[PDB]
Amino acid sequence: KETAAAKFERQHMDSSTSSSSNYCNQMMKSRNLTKDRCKPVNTFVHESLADVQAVCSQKNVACKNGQTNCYQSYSTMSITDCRETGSSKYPNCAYKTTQANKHIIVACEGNPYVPVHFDASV
């Protein structure tokens, strides 16, 4: 099906938004992150695809899993953190929408060298 690069865009990119308390509940479902099970946590980046792809040539840092192909953004980025609530019961996945401006860390692979995993936000 979709490529790893495509999967990263589907799960983590949302350039349209620069949202509401309903954001995560709507996005987690629309992006198919609650099809099999309620994905515990997920982050959406509100920056252009170009700016995010550019992170692959920025600050090289260690990935949480120990791999060395992670990169941290030199500048902060608008992001939205989605964290599953306690009352949330599949298929009705409920999330807590939390906006913030932090540096993101993504794992990059391939040719072209592009983001394939969202590792963290600091």
From Swiss-Prot:
<comment type="subunit">
    <text>Interacts with and forms tight 1:1 complexes with RNH1. Dimerization of two such complexes may occur. Interaction with RNH1 inhibits this protein. Monomer.</text>
</comment>
<dbReference type="GO" id="GO:0004540">
    <property type="term" value="F:RNA nuclease activity"/>
</dbReference>
<keyword id="KW-0378">Hydrolase</keyword>
<feature type="glycosylation site" description="N-linked (Glc) (glycation) lysine; in vitro">
    <location>
        <position position="35"/>
    </location>
</feature>
<feature type="active site" description="Proton acceptor">
    <location>
        <position position="12"/>
    </location>
</feature>
<keyword id="KW-0456">Lyase</keyword>
<feature type="disulfide bond">
    <location>
        <begin position="38"/>
        <end position="93"/>
    </location>
</feature>
<dbReference type="GO" id="GO:0004522">
    <property type="term" value="F:ribonuclease A activity"/>
</dbReference>
<feature type="binding site">
    <location>
        <position position="83"/>
    </location>
    <ligand>
        <name>substrate</name>
    </ligand>
</feature>
<feature type="glycosylation site" description="N-linked (Glc) (glycation) lysine; in vitro">
    <location>
        <position position="1"/>
    </location>
</feature>
<dbReference type="GO" id="GO:0005576">
    <property type="term" value="C:extracellular region"/>
</dbReference>
<dbReference type="GO" id="GO:0003676">
    <property type="term" value="F:nucleic acid binding"/>
</dbReference>
<dbReference type="GO" id="GO:0050830">
    <property type="term" value="P:defense response to Gram-positive bacterium"/>
</dbReference>
<feature type="disulfide bond">
    <location>
        <begin position="63"/>
        <end position="70"/>
    </location>
</feature>
<feature type="binding site">
    <location>
        <position position="7"/>
    </location>
    <ligand>
        <name>substrate</name>
    </ligand>
</feature>
<keyword id="KW-1015">Disulfide bond</keyword>
<comment type="similarity">
    <text>Belongs to the pancreatic ribonuclease family.</text>
</comment>
<feature type="disulfide bond">
    <location>
        <begin position="56"/>
        <end position="108"/>
    </location>
</feature>
<keyword id="KW-0732">Signal</keyword>
<feature type="disulfide bond">
    <location>
        <begin position="24"/>
        <end position="82"/>
    </location>
</feature>
<feature type="glycosylation site" description="N-linked (Glc) (glycation) lysine; in vitro">
    <location>
        <position position="7"/>
    </location>
</feature>
<keyword id="KW-0971">Glycation</keyword>
<dbReference type="GO" id="GO:0016829">
    <property type="term" value="F:lyase activity"/>
</dbReference>
<keyword id="KW-0255">Endonuclease</keyword>
<feature type="active site" description="Proton donor">
    <location>
        <position position="117"/>
    </location>
</feature>
<keyword id="KW-0325">Glycoprotein</keyword>
<protein>
    <recommendedName>
        <fullName>Ribonuclease pancreatic</fullName>
        <ecNumber>4.6.1.18</ecNumber>
    </recommendedName>
</protein>
<keyword id="KW-0964">Secreted</keyword>
<feature type="glycosylation site" description="N-linked (GlcNAc...) asparagine; partial">
    <location>
        <position position="32"/>
    </location>
</feature>
<feature type="binding site">
    <location>
        <position position="64"/>
    </location>
    <ligand>
        <name>substrate</name>
    </ligand>
</feature>
<comment type="function">
    <text>Endonuclease that catalyzes the cleavage of RNA on the 3' side of pyrimidine nucleotides. Acts on single-stranded and double-stranded RNA.</text>
</comment>
<feature type="binding site">
    <location>
        <begin position="39"/>
        <end position="43"/>
    </location>
    <ligand>
        <name>substrate</name>
    </ligand>
</feature>
<feature type="binding site">
    <location>
        <position position="10"/>
    </location>
    <ligand>
        <name>substrate</name>
    </ligand>
</feature>
<keyword id="KW-0540">Nuclease</keyword>
<feature type="glycosylation site" description="N-linked (Glc) (glycation) lysine; in vitro">
    <location>
        <position position="39"/>
    </location>
</feature>
